[PDB]
């Protein structure tokens, strides 16, 4: 049961490693704001089986890949400078 939707994910990018780097870089933000950051929300969010009902999957990277897979995020190679990137980041309920 290989990575869900990875064939699609490899095709999204030039060099595959780019893929990793995005997944990572996203699973990053998606963590450093309690998931109040998702693009996918409605009934798209990934979930977990239990001794209990469906709870929000707590895996950033798993979320990151589902996210990316919807064309709703963008890869700036050099778009938006790193100085301004950490700026408006700590804004929409960060602490």
């Amino acid at each position: 049961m290989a990575e869900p939707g990875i064939d699609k994910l490899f095709g999204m990018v030039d060099s595959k490693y780019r893929l990793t780097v995005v997944v990572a870089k996203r699973a990053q933000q998606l963590l450093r704001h309690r998931f109040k950051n998702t693009v996918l929300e409605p009934e798209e969010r990934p979930k977990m089986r239990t001794l209990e009902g469906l709870y929000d999957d707590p895996n950033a990277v798993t979320w990151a890949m589902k996210e990316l897979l919807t064309g709703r995020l963008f890869f700036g190679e050099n778009l938006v400078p790193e100085d301004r990137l950490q700026k408006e980041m700590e804004r929409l309920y960060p602490t």
Binding site: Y17, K25, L73, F74, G76, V80, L85, K87, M89
Partner: peptide, 23 residues
């Protein structure tokens, strides 16, 4: 992932981009 050709890649996120545009 430690290749100069890929590691600088940033991911901005829909509403984060337009809000970053307005400052």
């Amino acid at each position: 992932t430690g290749s100069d050709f890929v590691r600088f890649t940033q991911v901005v996120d829909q509403r984060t981009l337009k809000a970053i545009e307005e400052a």
